[model samples]
Target chain A: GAVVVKDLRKRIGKKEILKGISFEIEEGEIFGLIGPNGAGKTTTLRIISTLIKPSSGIVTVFGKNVVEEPHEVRKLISYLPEEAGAYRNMQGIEYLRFVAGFYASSSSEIEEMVERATEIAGLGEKIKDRVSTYSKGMVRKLLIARALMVNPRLAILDEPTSGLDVLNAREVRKILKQASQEGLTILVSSHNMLEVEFLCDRIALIHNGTIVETGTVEELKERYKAQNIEEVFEEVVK
Target chain B: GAVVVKDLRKRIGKKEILKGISFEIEEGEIFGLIGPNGAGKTTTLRIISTLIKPSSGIVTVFGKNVVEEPHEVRKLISYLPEEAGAYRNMQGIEYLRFVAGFYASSSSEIEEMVERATEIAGLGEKIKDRVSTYSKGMVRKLLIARALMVNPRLAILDEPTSGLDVLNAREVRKILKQASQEGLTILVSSHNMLEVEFLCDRIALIHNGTIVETGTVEELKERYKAQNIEEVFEEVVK
Candidate 1:
């Protein structure tokens, strides 16, 4: 019911990247992590994903310790980096097949997932073309499809709307909304303040490797007494 | 000081991308090229940059025909393509040096140029790292820095903030504003309505490869009777 991060600390050489950080993500609820670059967001995701072990910390997904049970945790989660560039060597459908295989999905299930993803991504016949010909936005959509195909409980998204057109962005939001309705827990990190305001239930903002602020959108706007969250972010994140 | 596009037409494999498209950019004016992903924004920028030739039409950058006098036209502008990729083998500084080489800057001048570009890109010490290791945002900043090193009369920035952090986006905007203040014409392509509103003096809406509407931001907003351009865009485009 909870993914807990306790005293998460990561250090690269002499540089102390993340200092004793801790947080709790409740099940079936969307959690938003907002931060600037070098704010330890990627490091935190990596620690959670087991791509890299933290210098010292404890991360548990639904009570399963990440260090002790990484494979199991990974099975229940999906991670999307800020910029997931497409591998031009593969077709869009082929890419979809490769990711679907990781989840051990049945062929029929994979087809269904790909179909649903293509709908959400609004992919065209161009997807039938080689990946080298796809634009960055088209590639982004394919990745979104991949992230959604598995239907993992905890979906971690980093800057998911980076190059999305408004329609596609809204479509992804609808997918997120649908995922929420279906009891999926999501964590999104983004630079667009207004988007976060529209998409997340609550947000934790980290600035310069420190959690400068955390609250609901309404709470933050009022707390900072600013015209917008960006101004508040500038005032505090700095 | 001005750029004009007349009946800009292009064909890709029997598909007519732009049809009788026309627009005019005045001196000291901030004009937005707004459209969906496939609505020809990138193609238009490429034509203006003289990187690609239109099937038919005339594009004049700073009063020089972009097609005929591409070299001379290129000298007056710096273009940032939406899906631009960098040579991963070059270090950030080395890449800057390559662009400086294009500008024919001296060794001493390039050293000074890279220093200023580093600060502008906020890359700092990472400036010495090879581009292959650079993240998407870092690559973006490096490209922008390369553009700035040229000190052209006009800048064509395609989706500059699509994948950057809010702080970095703000930083890039500051640099654009500074360039404009220094008498350089800047053209930005973006989907974030707030960005068009905050950064541009005028806006143009394109749909299905045609310039459907053109006006100041306020004029378009009023014409669509929408509070924001996003709603207006949805109502009209596609």
Candidate 2:
């Protein structure tokens, strides 16, 4: 498994967020964690990314257990949290350059990576402006560009298109498709059912801390006797 | 027309937000403004809601000018802005009661309104908790409940399901459909194409501050030779 999570449980204070959830993703596949808000989708991704340890579970990325080999897991994964942070004072290109510096040691290597990111982001002239002056959608694109620049084996994205407009969302989806085609396994979580239907190779429908259904779009639809994922979602989650 | 905007032009500093945009909504119709971020949707909604004035334009609600007859328009519409405000210290029920007070006079009338709101909100036990403790999705439901409680003739919802989960988004859609069935005209704006397709009877695709296409889903799809709104939107906006 490129990523494997078994019996994952997460608790925050007195509340249990995730209750014994399990799933697996194959290498070079775009796997989606589809659910409603506060359904522990983010919690699952966080655990897999080694950002936080599961209360009780086994999660591994490429055979390296997250808890035992945090550094090794970190090297293979790039995480893009919802509302991912960026350097407010830095311009878009400058930010990309900074992120590339981590993985690209040589000047020529960094330049090539930054150029590719600029092409992917397609921010145009606005790429020279400070991040603080960029709109929310622009910042999202910039952050996504930075995430793709490093070229990790697995990319963990949480609510990738939450607040973006359709054009920007389409752009982001295109970037992810390209990344997946290049053999990077993407594990994305989203509440946008249609987005998951269009983008994911397989989806896990989560509600109230547990995955209620998990399968390819065709499998879920056929099993539920529904036309689309939303209908299947309404059937499964309801 | 229930609402009509003509030659709507809004400029902030040197930037032109809405550049001579125009559209109309019939009485009792569910109209949607679909676009990407920074596409001047909110500006158009604000103008119709009488929260802001266009630099040069004419907007009317049922033939009454929005700028000159702002009070008349306000009396007939309920506007729900993003991150809609509520008394942080107040409990959810208390907040609902306060909102219900605006339209319901007698105690029994208030009680029934509050009960209906409680049912619609489905906040469960969390409704008794202070607003400060509610999640973003919870707050969105509360604000939406408040908007529906008073039963305005027209409801202007801006990005209503932006931060909500799929389950909550479905719930909100149900409520809006119920409200529409009860003879309320809804003017909703969103960047989510699937939402615009499922919710709105007629849609106006806006891009760079202009209404590029206005039609029913079938009409737009047929005209664009597209399979879905996303394709039609891409056709129209591009």
Candidate 3:
């Protein structure tokens, strides 16, 4: 029912990444975690996705220890990292087939999902081409479709539309919005304040590896005594 | 006093990229050239910076023709491409010395300029080591510094803070704001709508290969009947 964290701490050699972090995400919620570069946002996501181990403390995705029960957590949550590794030589159909292989879908099911995703992404002619030919936004959209395959309880996204333009960024947001309506709990992380404010239901500002502030857009604005979150961040981080 | 772009029709082989595009940038004006990926924004900046020639028409920077008098145009403008390519094999100091040799600068002035850039970019002590070890943000700061070395009449930047976090992105803005105070006409291209809205004096929205709308942030917002540039883009591009 809850994504729980109890004093989460991490270190890479002598470098301290996350220092005693603690937060809980409620069920059916869109939680946004924001910070500057190397502010431990990636590390936090990795830990939540059960991709990395915390140096100390505990993290439980629905009462299951993330590090201890990675397989269980994997089934529960799907994470879309900012960097998508697309096979340049492989055609779009090949990549879709590869995604299907992960969930052990049949050929027909794979074809169906691919078609659905390609259509949703508005990728018509480019679907048959090699992944190398796809634009950054197009590739990002394809990854979104891939994530949709799992239909997990929660989806953790890191800058889902980082390098996208106007049209493509909107398309990505629409897809996410659609997925969320299907009762998907999405946790998004980004540095784009406006975009995050627009998409996320609740936001947690993390600075210097700790949760600095957390609330809705209006709540944060009122709490921080600023018209926007950008100013709120400046005050806390300073 | 003015930057004139004349019927800038260009093609790359069989593909016609830009067709009869034209605009003008005024002196002491903070003009931002923007568009979607592959929308000829890069090509436009290259022509204005006198890096590449347009097959048809021309670009004249402050009364100097870029195609006819590239050397003179080059002398008046500073340029930063999407990707900063430097002599990585050499030491950081060595590369600085080499770049300094190209311009009229004493050893002391070169050191002073490098120190000042490193300070603004927040890359202290790290630059003393090597160019290869520089992070993306550090490299970006170095590029900003390099652009300042000549103290040109205008600055042309394309996606200057593409992958940076919010703080470093603001740092780039801080530097630009500082430079703006020095009376330099700065022209930048970006997909980050928030950055454009907050930073630029005026923005030109380029789609496909032409400016679809151009005005102050307030003017465009009012004209498009939207709260922000992102919404305006939705109404127009659709």
Candidate 4:
């Protein structure tokens, strides 16, 4: 498995955010964790990315325990948070250069990576402009470019297309789909069921910190005897 | 005419944000203004709501000039802005009471209005809690409820479902459809073309501050020979 989550439990204060969730992903697959507001989607993603620790249970990425070998896990994953912000003063190209510097040891490698990132994001001539000048969707594109430029084995994106316009959201989804085809594992968390249906190889419906159902889009729909994923979700969650 | 915008031009500093846009909407129609980011959808809606004056051109609601008779226009319309925030310390019902106080003349009227707002929002037990504890999507629901509670002739909503998940967005669309059937003229600005297609009776593709095309969803799609509204928007804007 590319990733494995076993009996994960997390409690913040007196509130039990995640009660014992478990799932696994195959290498090079696009997997989605979908649910409504206040679900454990973000918390689950955070634990897998080593940004936060689970109160109990285990999470592993590429056979490395996220809690014990945090450094090793960090080296294998790139995480994009929901509200990603860029350096307002830095130009898009400059930001890409700075991000590539973290993963590339040589200047030549950084230049090549930056070129690829710009092309993938399709920022065009706007790549030379200040980040402050970019719209919310444009900034989102730059952040995705930064996340992918490192060529991490697994990409973790939390509500990646949350605030973007339809055009921008479609562009972002297209980029992610292309990346997945190139043998990168993606773990995307979102409430956009239609997006998940379009992009995911398999999905897990997380509700109130526990996964209520896990299957491919067709499997879930068939299991619930519903016409679509949304109807299936309503049946499962309700 | 329900709403009229003619030769609307808006300039801030040296930038021309809107350059001579014009469109008309009928009474009891749900009209959508859609475009890419920074395409002047919000600016156009704001002008129509009488929140801001256009540098050049005219706007009227129900045949009354927005600028010349701002007071009358205010009484006839309800506007909801993107990322609207509620008072953190106030409970949902308390906030509704404060808002209802503005349009309601008597104690019984305010109580009646609050009841309807809560029912429309469907916030359930959360209505008794502080706004600070609400989710982003929940706040959006409250804002929508607040906008529609007054029963105005027209409602202007800017990106009403921007931050919501699929389920929440679907719920908002359902509410708006119901309101339209009950005879409310709505002007909604969004980047979600799929959403506009589902909820809008007619749509205007606003690009770079101008109305490139305006028609019913079918009319626009058939005119461009496109697969869907998204394709239609791409064809028109491109």
User: In terms of lDDT, which candidate is stronger, 1 or 4?
Assistant: 4
User: What is candidate 1's local distance difference test score?
Assistant: 0.75
Q: Put down candidate 4 lDDT per residue, A166-209, tens digits, no spaces.
A: 99999988999999999999999989877777888998877666
Indicate which candidate wins on lDDT.
Answer: 4
Q: Evaluate candidate 1 and give its CAPRI docking class based on DockQ.
A: incorrect
Worst 10 residues of 2 chain A by lDDT: A229-238
> Least lDDT summed over 10 consecutive residues: which range in candidate 2 chain B?
B229-238
- Summarize candidate 1's per-residue lDDT along B1-238 as a digit string, tens digits: 3789976877667455665467778776667898767777888878888888998889998789988888888878888877577789988888887777765668888787777677767787888999999888788888887777667778898988787788777877777777677777877787677677777877777765656566788866765577888876665432
Give per-residue CA lDDT, model 1, range A86-140, as digits (tens): 6788888887777777666688887887776676566778767778888777787
1 or 4: which has the higher TM-score? 4
Per-residue lDDT tens digits for candidate 2, residues A134-215, read 8888888888888877778999999888898888888888888888999999999998987777789988777667565677
What is the Å distance of residue A9 in model 4 from its true position?
62
Error of 4 at A226 (Å): 58
Native-interface RMSD of candidate 4: 23.3
B184 in model 4: Cα distance from truth in Å? Answer: 0.5
At residue B21, what lDDT does model 4 achieve?
66
Q: What tens digits encode model 3's per-residue C-alpha lDDT throughout A1-238?
A: 5588766878777555675566678777777888777677888988899888998889888778898888888889988888776777888768878877777668777777777667656677888899999888888888888877666788989888788898888888888887777788888888877677667777777765656556687766765567877886775444
**Runs of candidate 2 exceeding 4 Å displacement:** A102-105, B1-238
Query: What are the per-residue Cα lDDT tens digits for candidate 2 across B152-178?
Result: 788999998887888878888878887
> Order of candidates by TM-score, top first?
4, 2, 3, 1
lDDT of 4 by residue, B1-238 (tens): 9998876778776555775567789999999998878888888888888888999889989999998999999999999988898888999999999989988779998998899899988999999999999988888888899999988999999998897899989999989999999999999998988777788999877766656567788867765677688887665433
